[PDB]
Amino acid sequence: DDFAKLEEQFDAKLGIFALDTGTNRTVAYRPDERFAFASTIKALTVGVLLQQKSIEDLNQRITYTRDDLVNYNPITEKHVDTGMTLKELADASLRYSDNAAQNLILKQIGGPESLKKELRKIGDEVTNPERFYPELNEVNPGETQDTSTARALVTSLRAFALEDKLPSEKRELLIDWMKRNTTGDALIRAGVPDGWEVADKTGAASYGTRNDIAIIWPPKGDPVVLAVLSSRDKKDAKYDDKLIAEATKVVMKALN
Ligand SMILES: *C(=O)[C@@H](NC(=O)Cc1cccs1)[C@@H]1NC(C(=O)O)=C(C)CS1
């Protein structure tokens, strides 16, 4: 009833799944409820890129133009004349939620259809990548394009970051990028005590969709993998980062 209280306090629908990899103990609330995955998909997208390439292969330089730039391009809008390596695009996507960086990487793996195929191969029958930025933002209730569930995003994030979908040197790159994310200080990080390492990827979309997926390391102990997804009734609705932070506080309470 602490999660229902947050839905009551913030007038929002809330999607929680947490796995303690150390006890296999679980926290869940609407864990199988679909939400627009928003920019959270970028973590799984770098996952597939890392599978498809050697670390040295990430040094390939991608040429792009203004036409590849979309609504939010904080790193890519800077480097049209120089281009950017796949490694630099991975950094821009993960650490700044650069939408153009994600589009370029997605086109590097062979598009949303190709991304879906590789996600099915790792055991994810839930996540439905279909469109590029900006179109994957517009998800109306009941539609399943560009949606996942808290359980599926956690399971998939764990598979790439923590299990055997990637060799250790590639897991280190993904985990390092997500640890040094710049977009998440108000969300999962804000519900976890200082000093604990957090790797995360944020997202925001229509119907006030406000998402964070994370790996949380206690000082010693095995990590927690967490998805906090949320959405609201109205297309143009605002979100509140504080919902995600408080939801995160409730999860840690339930696991400790
Ligand atoms: C993914 O969530 C991305 N969201 C969008 O491109 C849709 C919007 C544009 C402006 C407002 S909503 C990028 N990621 C994030 C994030 O992860 O926090 C934000 C803030 C918007 S761009």
Curated annotation (Swiss-Prot):
- Tell me what reaction this enzyme catalyses: a beta-lactam + H2O = a substituted beta-amino acid
A single cellular component GO annotation: plasma membrane
Q: What sort of enzyme, by top EC class, is this? A: hydrolase
What switches on expression, per the entry, is described as: By the bacillus licheniformis protein BlaR1.
Enzyme Commission identifier(s): 3.5.2.6
Q: Where in the cell is it found?
A: Cell membrane
List, in alphabetical order, the GO biological process terms annotated in this UniProt record: beta-lactam antibiotic catabolic process; response to antibiotic
Keyword flag Signal:
yes
Q: In which broad location class does this protein mainly occur, judging by the first location in its UniProt entry? A: membrane
Molecular function via GO: beta-lactamase activity
Record keywords, A-Z = Antibiotic resistance, Cell membrane, Hydrolase, Lipoprotein, Membrane, Palmitate, Signal
Q: How does it sit in the membrane?
A: Lipid-anchor
Post-translational modification note: Large exopenicillinase is the primary secretion product; it can be converted to small exopenicillinase.
The UniProt record's further free-text remark is: The class A beta-lactamase family has a specific amino-acid numbering system, sometimes called Ambler or ABL numbering and often misspelt as Amber. A multiple sequence alignment was used to derive a consensus sequence and then the consensus was numbered taking into account insertions and deletions. This allows use of identical numbers, e.g. for active site residues, despite differences in protein length. UniProt always uses natural numbering of residues, hence there appear to be differences in numbering between this entry and some papers.
Q: Which family does it belong to?
A: Belongs to the class-A beta-lactamase family.
What is this protein's record name?
Beta-lactamase
Q: Which gene encodes it?
A: penP
Q: Parent protein range shown?
A: 48 to 303 of 307
